[PDB]
Structure 1
Amino acid sequence: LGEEVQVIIVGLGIVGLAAAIECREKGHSVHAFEKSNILKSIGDCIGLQSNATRIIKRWGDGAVHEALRPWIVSSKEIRIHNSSGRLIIRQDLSEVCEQPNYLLPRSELIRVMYEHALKIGVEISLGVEVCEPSEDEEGASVVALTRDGERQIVRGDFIICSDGVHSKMRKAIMPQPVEPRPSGYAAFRALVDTETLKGDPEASWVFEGVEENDRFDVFFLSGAQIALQSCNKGKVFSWFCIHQDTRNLLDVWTSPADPNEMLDLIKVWPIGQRLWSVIRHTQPQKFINYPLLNHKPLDHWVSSHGRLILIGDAAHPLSPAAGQGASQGIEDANVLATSLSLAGRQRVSLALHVAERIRYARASAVQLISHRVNEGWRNQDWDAYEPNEQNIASLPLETWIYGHDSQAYTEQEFEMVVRAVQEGEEYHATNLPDKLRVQLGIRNV
């Protein structure tokens, strides 16, 4: 017959934009829907590791990577300090940053990806909340709701559910929700106002060397782990502070936290004032206190008829750390688009199920390693013990993660995964260490 493949994408965060670009560059017709005004600045910085940048580098013949070049990480080490600000450990980043990594405001990453998606012909509809997905053996559909209450049925060959950690699409796949477990920790975090930071002489130290090497400082205080970073030659500074918090906080990016809670936490220790000299230039409405919740892996990501798939934080939400949360979502988009092109238009359900088998254990392993990091904090004493790079929130920094080429793996393994899906056998993926799958309690889909 020959009609274009019709892809529906629900949610244009990082992962939905990546999926839109990957699918459109395979020639599909892509209609993406997003309920919020995503061009408005919100949040702070996102990191992307080499497993994500090697995917991004292929897009638009390298054009997106060229746009992101100012944001390539130039830190060569993490400088880890105690509560007096004395340097204890320099953790070398030369292998992690052998290939490009990015650090940049999330809103700027969104803007660059959005502009590329428009340029290549992704159809985008903002101010639309998608609900009520359905599917049968031949296609899928959703209801698109504008804010003024107009309803429209939208039909497609399959739905990519990239609607984030609070995904309402997720109830179409998993009938019952599993509530995440609070880690007992939260992260104060924000961007600093660079203009007021400049011209505060008591904060001038933070600019030292940032035009040659991005700042990447960590400080361990009793009950407080503070990271301070710069990017794009000192144009942007960001920070976070991991701390105990048992309040019933919502995991959203929209509510202003009390800056004095952060000040009280750090000002009683020797380095606190020096840290505050920079962090006090955070705009008073931009202080975020984000709870770190641990989500268990889902039983599966693909719907009964194989025409809806959860990817990104809808499927495997992690704490904002490493860059690996976002980076795993970008691998979702790449593997899914590659699977769709190897399977062909007549085998959509196969393509989605193959993508799931390739992604599931690897994504779940990154998720469970993330849990181990914040579960370790309850047994630690950051005042009594010397600072330990093993305790930093930026972990894991593992070659089997950031060195991986998800597209090449998918090409090589596609026919083997097809046989597993069609025969109903387990697929033992080798895109994570052999013993890691069994070691973490991971149950194959």
Structure 2
Amino acid sequence: GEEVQVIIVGLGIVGLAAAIECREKGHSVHAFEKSNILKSIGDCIGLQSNATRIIKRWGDGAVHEALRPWIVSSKEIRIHNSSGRLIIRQDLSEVCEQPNYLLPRSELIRVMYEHALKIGVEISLGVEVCEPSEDEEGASVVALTRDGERQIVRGDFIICSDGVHSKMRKAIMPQPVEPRPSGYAAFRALVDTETLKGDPEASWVFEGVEENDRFDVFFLSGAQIALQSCNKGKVFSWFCIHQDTRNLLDVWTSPADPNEMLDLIKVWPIGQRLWSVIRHTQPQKFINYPLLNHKPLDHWVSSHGRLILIGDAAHPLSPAAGQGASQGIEDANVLATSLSLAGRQRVSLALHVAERIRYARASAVQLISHRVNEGWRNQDWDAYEPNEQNIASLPLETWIYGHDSQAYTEQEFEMVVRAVQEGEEYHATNLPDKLRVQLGIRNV
């Protein structure tokens, strides 16, 4: 009477959620990660209510208590024009009915990493996983260490949560499709809180932040800028979507030129005010990340049903929209629930059930987000003032953030099993009926 043996490749946000979900539900987990995931890198990650619904269950509420300093307290989004005038206050009252988090990525990683070690996930860092294989009875990978040693590692199935540049994707989709550039990029960073404090010209940014997180949006010709705070003003973060036709690589490590941001904003009346804050970004923390459009894959599960791509390995989203991490956490929760309902003798059924629950929903978020940064609702600001028309409603969509993916999986498991095994199409109701046919989403 043994436990299911789960191999996880990659401990970004989704791999760590997968590890915690699987272990909490009684399965044995060996996770593999090639780098030191604890180094501070990136800026802030947003988690909406569909993700925090899931996180709240971890450790009878332990991870939620650890994340409590990061609960979003913004009551509205304040939308401004290039003079800095406040045009519209968009109410966040229903979006914030249930908890949302905003926090540096590395602090999220740390909290999940420590919880995973506490509940008995086995973690191997400094391990590049490659050469996965599978049959009707099990799966294995090669664990390659930095000294060149190879170790074969066997388990019941492999979770590929190895990010947008996934090398495991080959094992499922042989020929790779290249994402299409949108012609837009995003400047983004954390601000150095210590030098931001002590600059009088930037003092305005702290007003109110101890009771209501800042969430200011600024629409300039050629730049859409958002400035947010969190944890009572201990962290400030900003981003700026601008036009960029350069051949930029989509990684989080390359140095950008801060003067490119400055030149873009200083020519409008509100530029000096915004720069008084943004100037306190550390020089080697300026990221300029291209917003690429990834087409949904044809499927996520391998031929023998023992490998599944889940997070950005399955459905990369640009940081522009705000559902990337949240959707990946739903992947881990639906998969772990599916594996629990199906049992150890029905692993391939478990993976195929989870893919059919998640595919159309995740593809719809992915396809809508294309129209957000490759197109968008950006008008001539010489003639129009910004308003809610110009705020990508994706994080404000109740059918995304109100969803309870574990409840759905439990209520629908047997109907999905029936479709898998009878070879019928499963029409999931965890997205709007009109949406699937409108976006051209074909069922797996």
Q: State the alpha-carbon separation in 1 of the partners of residues 12 and 272 from structure 2.
A: 36
Following superposition, the deviation at residue 80 of structure 1 comes to 0.3
| Worse overlay, 361-370 or 379-388 | 379-388
* C-alpha displacement of 1:59: 0.4
Contact 1:47 1:322 survives alignment (8 Å):
no
Pair 1:45-2:44 in alignment: yes
Does structure 2 conserve the Cα–Cα contact (< 8 Å) formed by 1:321 and 1:394? no
1:8-36 C-alpha deviation (Å, 9 max, x unpaired): 00000000000000000111110000011
Structure 2 contact 378–390 (Cα < 8 Å) conserved = no
Structure 2: distance between partners of 1:44 and 1:390: 27
Q: Which consecutive unaligned segments of at least 5 residues does structure 1 have?
A: none
TM-score by length of 1: 0.98
Q: Contact 1:373/1:391 (CA < 8 Å) preserved in 2?
A: no
- Contact 1:128 / 1:145 at 8 angstroms: preserved in 2? yes
Shift of residue 208, structure 1, vs aligned partner = 0.2
Distance 2:375 2:284 in 1: 31
Instruction: For residue 440 of structure 2, give the secondary structure of its aligned residue in structure 1.
Output: coil
Kindly state the Cα deviation for residue 423 of structure 1 after the two structures are TM-superposed.
1.0
State the secondary structure of the residue aligned to 2:369: helix
TM-score (norm 2): 0.99
What is the DSSP-based 3-state SS (H/G/I as helix, E as strand, rest coil) of the residue aligned with 2:300?
A: coil
- CA deviations 1:197-219 (Å, max 9, x no partner) are 00000000000000000000000
- How far did 1:64 drift? 0.2
Structure 2: distance between partners of 1:385 and 1:182: 27
* Superposed displacement of residue 389, structure 1: 2.4
**TM-superposition CA deviations, 1:29-72 (whole Å, max 9, x none):** 10000011110000000000000000000000000000000000
By how many angstroms is 1:383 displaced? 4.2
* Cα distance in 2, alignment partners of residues 130 and 143 from structure 1: 6
Deviation of 1:392 after TM superposition, in Å, equals 3.0
Per-residue CA deviations over 1:300-341 (Å, capped at 9, x if unaligned) read: 000000000000100001011443110000000000000000
Distance 1:3 1:125 in 2: 22
Distance in 2 (CA, whole Å) between partners of 1:435 and 1:206 is: 42
On the 8 A contact 1:79/1:89 being kept in 2, the answer is: yes
1:348 aligned partner:
347
SS of aligned partner of 2:109: helix
**Alpha-carbon contact 1:322-1:394 (below 8 Å) kept:** no
Q: Contact between 2:48 and 2:99, CA under 8 Å: does it hold in 1?
A: yes
Deviations 1:126-162 (A, max 9, x none): 1111000000000000001111111100000000000
Mapped contact 1:369–1:396 kept (Cα < 8 A): no
Judge conservation of contact 2:184–2:374 (CA < 8 Å) in 1.
no
Deviation at 1:404, TM superposition (A): 0.3
Greater displacement, 79-88 / 143-152: 143-152
**Deviations 1:69-125, CA, capped at 9 Å, x for gaps:** 000000010000000000001100000010000000000000000000000000001
Give 1:3 deviation, angstroms. 1.6
SS at match of 2:113: helix
d(CA) in 1 for partners of 2:392, 2:131: 37
Deviations 1:177-200 (A, max 9, x none): 111011100000000000000000
Pairing of 1:2-401 with structure 2 (within 5 A)? 2-377=1-376, 380-392=379-391, 395-401=394-400
* 3-state SS in 1 of match to 2:20: helix
RMSD across aligned positions (CA): 1.0
Rate the CA distance shift 1:289–1:435 in 2: closer, same or farther, 3 A. Answer: same
Say which is worse superposed, 119-128 or 384-393, in terms of deviation. Answer: 384-393
* 1:380 Cα deviation after fit: 3.2
Q: Note closer, same or farther for the CA distance 1:383–1:374 as it changes in structure 2 (3 Å cut).
A: farther
In structure 2, the residue corresponding to 1:282 is in which secondary structure? coil
Residues 31 and 382 (structure 1 numbering): CA distance in 2 closer, same or farther, change over 3 Å? farther
> Secondary structure of 1:185's match?
strand
**1:254-289: CA deviation from partner (whole Å, max 9, x where unpaired):** 011000000000001100000000000000000000
Task: Give the conservation status (yes or no) of the 8 Å contact 2:95–2:401.
Answer: yes
Paired residues of 1:45 and 1:106 also in contact (CA < 8 A) = yes
Looking at structure 1, the residues matched to 238 and 39 of structure 2 have their Cα atoms a distance apart, in angstroms, of: 21
Provide the C-alpha distance between the structure 1 equivalents of 2:351 and 2:275, rounded to a whole number of angstroms: 48
CA contact under 8 A between 1:32 and 1:125: conserved in structure 2? yes
Tell me, in whole angstroms, the C-alpha distance in 2 between the residues paired with 1:210 and 1:164: 33
- Gap change, CA 1:324 and 1:379, over 3 Å in 2: closer
Shift of 1:378: 8.2
Note the C-alpha offset of 1:223. Answer: 0.2
Deviations 1:202-261 (A, max 9, x none): 000000000000000000000000000000000000000000000000010001100000
